[PDB]
């Protein structure tokens, strides 16, 4: 009896941290036509309905949203999808030509003076020996003067040739589910006050993650998930100011963005089967694009985030909000895509407040660009075709990306500024509750068994 | 109602249960192990790697004389050095994760002992078959 012997068990429920290649799944409804979408993937298998989520009682797991894999994989997959959706489209090599530009004083407002240029240029036709004189409207951010006459060129012409986005392909994000392959499991942290790292007392195993929409934006997380109980402040090292602070709201803040210009699209034949979609005359008045948020709602949300930040920086601390220090237009502005148009909004009014220890709306102007450098890459630029009519979109601000300034000693004041630029933080805000583990089905334990001779 | 037992019968449903109780749901994990351009290449590589891992595990089990069995009793006696813990403690209090953490140090020693025991048993079978 006291003589115990080794018994071998296969299929034991034990696992370890591991990295693998998850396979994406998309909702079946997405397969109803609408194949023209950047994120529409044929690889993504149909979503298994009535998903099953098994709760692992008494199991405590260690999570780390900052060293987490399955965020780098998501970044890579999104970038690859973006490139794949751009391969078949037109390369705008002929567009790198001298332009004779002039201002559009055609019922513009004082804030839109010089923002639009009326540029005329010679272009190749479908016949190699013929040329056409055409004109288009270009945003001042897309053309740079070259030096009487005033000649311009596209900003990208000394770096690379831009690929025109296919007009039928949509930029609207669609939910994507990441699923574990054979021999692997995805563990979900069900704790509602989880700060992204450390043990998670409440754990469950899921076949696939919740549908995560690949929303690309800076300084403001849009259309994401909301904290269930309180505003969550998450940082790899809160004391270290070099680390971005990810803020998750418990209630959304509605943001209304519009491009009030009635744009007109114009097709120009660049070559055999090649079309360049230019911008024709704007029908009506020319006015600045802008976004609106409720003043009271934003103030309440800022008060809440300040309340949660004081838990990390002391009660009697002055918390200040300031606009971006500087950098490229992508990071210093709230960048996002609104119905196929790319916005660059000046959020200086959203982050203008100092908080003491004790029906109006905020209109923040926005600028439009058509030459897009996504994923912080250089040499791969995309030209966004113009969109006819008036653009309008409504979104939820579900979080922030903040950066703290290095203060000398303890100056009883902390100033936070909006950040972003690295989309891995955007995915990280949705995958913080997930991890991938590898099953280890082989187990040896003492049992009072003995084999024959 | 379906009942909470179906959860116990789900994948990793017994991960938190006592190893004695988790020993009755081995087949779930065992079957999950075989569940079924660059994206296609990566998916194919993952599938091939999973197949290779499963085959390596099966080859190990066969090398221990445990081929085709999910629970296999052996001839290797249990060393008190590996764990002086009682039987009731192990099979009614701990879970497989805790037990794996405890005995992770001696796993290779146990594997080598199992291999040696199977080799000795095979040659003893062959020698008794040298006698019959």
């Amino acid at each position: 009896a006291e003589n115990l012997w080794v018994t071998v068990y296969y299929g034991v429920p034990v696992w370890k941290d591991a990295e693998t290649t998850l396979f994406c799944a998309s909702d079946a409804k997405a397969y109803e036509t609408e194949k023209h979408n950047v994120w529409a993937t044929h690889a993504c298998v149909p979503t298994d309905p009535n998903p099953q989520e098994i709760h692992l009682e008494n199991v405590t797991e260690e999570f780390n949203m900052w060293k987490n894999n399955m965020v780098e994989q998501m970044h890579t997959d999104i970038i690859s999808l973006w490139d794949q959706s751009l391969k078949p489209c037109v390369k705008l090599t002929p567009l790198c030509v001298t332009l004779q530009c002039t201002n559009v004083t055609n019922n513009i407002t004082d804030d839109m003076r010089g923002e639009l240029k009326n540029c005329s240029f010679n272009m190749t036709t479908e016949l190699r020996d013929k040329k056409q004189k055409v004109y288009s409207l270009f945003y001042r951010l897309d053309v740079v003067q070259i030096n009487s006459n005033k000649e311009y060129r596209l900003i990208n012409c000394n770096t690379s040739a831009c690929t025109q986005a296919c007009p039928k392909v949509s930029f609207e994000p669609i939910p994507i589910h990441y699923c574990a392959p054979a021999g692997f499991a995805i563990l979900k942290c069900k704790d509602k006050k989880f700060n992204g790292t450390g043990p998670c007392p409440s754990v469950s195993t899921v076949q696939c993650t919740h549908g995560i929409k690949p929303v690309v934006s800076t300084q403001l997380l849009l259309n994401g998930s909301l904290a269930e109980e309180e505003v969550m402040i998450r940082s790899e090292n809160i004391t270290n100011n070099a680390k971005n602070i990810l803020v998750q709201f418990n209630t959304p803040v509605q943001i209304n963005c519009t491009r009030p210009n009635n744009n007109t699209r114009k097709s120009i034949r660049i070559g055999p089967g090649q079309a360049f979609y230019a911008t024709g005359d704007i029908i009506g008045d020319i006015r600045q694009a802008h976004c609106n948020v409720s003043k009271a709602t934003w103030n309440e949300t800022l008060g809440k985030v300040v309340k949660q930040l004081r838990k990390h920086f002391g009660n009697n601390t002055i918390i200040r909000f300031a606009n971006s220090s500087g950098g490229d237009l992508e990071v210093t502005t709230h960048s996002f895509n609104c119905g196929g148009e790319f916005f660059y909004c000046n959020t200086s009014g959203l982050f203008n407040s100092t908080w003491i220890s004790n029906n109006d709306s905020i209109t923040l102007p926005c600028r439009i660009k058509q030459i897009i450098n996504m994923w912080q890459r250089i040499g791969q630029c995309m030209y966004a075709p113009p969109i006819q009519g008036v653009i309008r979109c409504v979104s939820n601000i579900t979080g922030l990306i903040l950066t703290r300034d290095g203060g000398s000693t303890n100056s009883t004041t902390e100033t936070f500024r909006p950040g972003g630029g690295d989309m891995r933080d955007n995915w990280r805000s949705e995958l913080y509750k997930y991890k991938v583990v590898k099953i280890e089905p082989l187990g040896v334990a003492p049992t009072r068994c003995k084999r024959r001779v | 109602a379906v009942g909470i037992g179906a959860v116990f019968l789900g994948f990793l449903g017994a991960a938190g249960s006592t190893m004695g109780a988790a020993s009755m749901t081995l087949t779930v994990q065992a079957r999950n192990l075989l569940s079924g351009t660059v994206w296609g290449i990566k998916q194919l590589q993952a599938r091939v790697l999973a197949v290779e891992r499963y085959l390596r595990d099966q080859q190990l089990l066969g090398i221990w004389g445990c081929s085709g069995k999910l629970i296999c009793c052996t001839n290797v006696p249990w060393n008190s050095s590996w764990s002086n813990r009682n039987l009731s403690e192990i099979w009614d209090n701990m879970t497989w994760l805790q037990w794996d953490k405890e005995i992770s140090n001696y796993t290779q020693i146990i594997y080598g002992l199992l291999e040696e025991s199977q080799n000795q048993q095979e040659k003893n079978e062959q020698d008794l078959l040298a006698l019959d």
Partner: antibody
Amino acid sequence: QAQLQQSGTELVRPGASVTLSCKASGYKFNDYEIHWVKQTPVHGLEWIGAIVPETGFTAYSQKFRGKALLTADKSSSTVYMDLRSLTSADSAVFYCSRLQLFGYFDVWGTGTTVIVSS
Amino acid sequence: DVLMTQNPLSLPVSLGDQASISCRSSQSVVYSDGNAYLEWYLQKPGQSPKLLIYKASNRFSGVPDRFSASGSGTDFTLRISRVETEDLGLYYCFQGTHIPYTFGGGTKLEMKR
């Protein structure tokens, strides 16, 4: 004669732990799994947990996870709840009920009115 | 997670009439096996809850033909015909597919004199 018997009334002080019981008789204990539901007029009927006597698997709900501790004895065919850190909100009637896989709560208990008072 | 909404809170009815109880689920209740485990339970004053219908369509055990339930997915309804004095009590709808299970808000049947 499948019946479930539980204690009638237990009066204890707040911050203490009470041990209830649910005697299973007249039917094979193993086959069915015993569930518990509280009967309160403010929060309504809620499910606490359910045990399978065979494997001892204990399933809980997040609304009463933690303090609720459920144990069973196969020999005596008994299922107990050990509820700790009792407050006024815990005073209600607890029904112990049996269930089968893909079955139904065919038979229930008589209830157990618990009062938390010093 | 599975919110079980039951309406109306009170359902007055005269003896011999028909009373209808509506109970709506927040999400789908159909399990992977294909069956929907939604049950209706009745609690009399001073008595423990009693099962009436299981599977939302099948009768528990020779319960009256008066007690008939129907519905699908989000919407489920229990109908009681020829109301009798013994039918007084609280009716509760309950789903048993997704853990944790939840009970209905409760409908108080009231007989009329």
